[PDB]
Design a binder for this molecule. Structure first.
Ligand code: HEM
Ligand code: HEM
Ligand code: HEM
Ligand code: HEM
Length: 107
């Protein structure tokens, strides 16, 4: 579809922004994150209206923006959900990839 963006993209819908780099995610297919919607992968921003636009962090339905980035019981893998699988039981990878503070997502 469109060309992937350069690294250094800041996701900043909340008070805890995170930088997302496509280059470090080259082993994952585009469509595993810009997931199919009605049979076609969608490339719009995750928080676009009508998409995951509920900014209530206690909302764990599919509309919750915090939920889609962090939770494990999801239909497509979230940021944290896939990272738990990648980090396994290695303390260094868990710190960098899944920690809530002092990790590569949240300083
Ligand atoms: C695969 C090479 C692939 C493509 C192509 C791609 C495209 C893409 C675009 C065009 C954007 C910008 C969207 C906008 O309107 O700002 C964008 C942004 C994000 N991407 Fe992506 N992307 C590809 C692959 C992947 C992979 C493998 C993941 C998941 C690991 C992923 C995730 C994201 C995220 C998150 C964003 C930011 C969205 C937001 O709401 O800010 N992309 N991508
Ligand atoms: C932006 C790259 C983006 C992410 C991240 C994302 C994640 C995501 C997850 C983890 C789920 C599962 C939720 C659960 O509780 O099981 C999920 C599901 C749906 N999504 Fe999504 N999503 C991103 C992008 C978009 C966009 C741009 C839209 C709006 C067109 C959208 C919509 C949906 C819908 C609909 C679902 C439900 C699944 C279904 O049955 O179709 N997402 N998303
Ligand atoms: C969800 C949008 C999401 C975010 C945010 C994210 C962040 C992230 C960081 C900060 C790193 C470290 C490298 C860097 O600074 O770019 C990293 C690395 C890996 N990720 Fe990730 N990631 C998000 C989503 C996902 C998803 C959905 C998957 C799996 C489906 C995934 C996987 C990976 C992998 C693999 C790595 C590299 C690990 C390594 O080389 O040690 N991420 N991600
Ligand atoms: C550890 C499990 C952990 C916690 C706790 C956590 C919390 C957190 C908060 C409070 C926010 C802001 C929510 C709001 O609406 O104010 C937030 C935002 C994002 N996070 Fe997070 N987070 C934890 C861990 C991780 C990890 C390991 C990553 C990267 C894989 C990650 C990612 C994200 C993303 C993306 C966002 C949204 C950024 C934005 O758009 O502002 N979190 N997190």
């Amino acid at each position: 579809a469109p060309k992937a963006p350069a690294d250094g993209l800041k996701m900043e819908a909340t008070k805890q922004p995170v930088v997302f780099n496509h280059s470090t995610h080259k082993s994952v297919k585009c469509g595993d994150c810009h997931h199919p919607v009605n049979g076609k992968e969608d490339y719009r921003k995750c928080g676009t209206a009508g998409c995951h636009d509920s900014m209530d962090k206690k909302d764990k339905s599919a509309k919750g923006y915090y939920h889609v980035m962090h939770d494990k019981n999801t239909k497509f893998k979230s940021c944290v959900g896939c990272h738990v699988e990648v980090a396994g039981a290695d303390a260094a990878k868990k710190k960098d990839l899944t920690g809530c503070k002092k990790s590569k997502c949240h300083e």
